[PDB]
């Protein structure tokens, strides 16, 4: 979620990802932990086996074969963590994640009940404004002369500088509001 994806997965990434998928599905069939441990070690035997085959034209043919084998022995209903995509708690609290900007419409009589939270907030709104100009400038200075771009972002290279485009990450609502 935090890291933007690359342009394309390498062979190394496509095999590790399969490895994790194939174990999680094994655990879905086995259930029992002792039985899940036994077959998880057999699974690693099948991945250590062709670990070094560096043909790079049969390694691929060993992956498409293994994905087509995974897709046939899927669990029709794998276990999912409650907060993960497809999970039962997935996005349960998204109705409680009010953006911080909604406080900017609060009535004064509402703001009068939290005088010290609302004072540590005008500092953050100042810090955000003074930092903005220097953030925009830094992002042009690192705009590579060749258009090739990636979703990643640069840090603060100086002192007294916050990393550019930091407000929507730092201020984001809590995972469990």
């Amino acid at each position: 979620a935090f890291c933007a994806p690359p342009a394309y997965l390498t062979h190394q990434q496509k095999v590790l990802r399969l490895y994790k998928r194939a174990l999680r599905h094994l655990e879905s069939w086995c259930i029992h932990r002792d039985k899940y441990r036994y077959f998880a070690c057999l699974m690693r035997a099948r991945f250590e086996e062709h670990k070094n085959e560096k043909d790079m034209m049969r390694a691929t043919q060993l992956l498409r074969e293994a994905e087509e084998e995974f897709w046939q022995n899927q669990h029709p209903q794998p276990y999912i963590f409650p907060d993960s995509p497809g999970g039962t708690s997935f996005e349960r609290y998204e109705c409680y994640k009010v953006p911080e900007w909604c406080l900017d419409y609060w009535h004064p009589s509402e703001k009068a009940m939290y005088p010290d939270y609302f004072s540590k907030r005008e500092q953050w709104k100042k810090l955000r404004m003074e930092s903005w100009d220097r953030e925009v400038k830094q992002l042009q200075e690192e705009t590579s002369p060749d258009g090739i771009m990636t979703e990643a972002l640069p840090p603060a290279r100086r002192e007294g500088d916050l990393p550019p485009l930091w407000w929507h990450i730092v201020t984001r609502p809590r995972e469990r509001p």
Binding site: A7, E67, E68, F70, W71, V136, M149, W167
Partner: protein, 126 residues
């Protein structure tokens, strides 16, 4: 065995022959797409995080979509044999079908009231 796709059950990314393509021509396609993606993502962020913003972030992609689906349909419509038949059938097809259902039903109903063969026994509201 083997998985046969369909429009409502597409092909998994991991079973796609064209997803294990690594020839340099594809990899360059996949790197320009990301560059176009990142260029836009950068521009959206430079508005989302802007502190002097006071309104929402207008979306040209959404304006184009809604305009393509209303104000731009008719100018880009040309009559053809397939359109004209489709509109003729779509237009009057259902209307003729129902006409005979109702007309046939109500003729059987008017026939059975002249010969008294109906049981309107407790019916006093219509």
């Amino acid at each position: 065995s083997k998985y046969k796709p369909a429009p409502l059950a597409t092909l998994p990314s991991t079973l796609d022959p064209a997803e294990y393509d690594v020839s340099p021509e594809t990899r360059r396609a996949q790197v320009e797409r990301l560059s176009i993606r990142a260029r836009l993502k950068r521009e959206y962020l430079l508005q989302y995080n802007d502190p002097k913003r006071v309104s929402h972030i207008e979306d040209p992609a959404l304006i184009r979509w809604t305009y393509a689906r209303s104000a731009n349909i008719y100018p880009n419509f040309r009559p053809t044999p397939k359109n004209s038949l489709l509109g003729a059938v779509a237009g009057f097809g259902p209307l003729i079908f129902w006409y005979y259902v109702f007309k046939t039903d109500r003729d059987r109903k008017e026939r059975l009231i002249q010969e008294g063969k109906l049981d309107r026994k407790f019916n006093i509201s219509y």
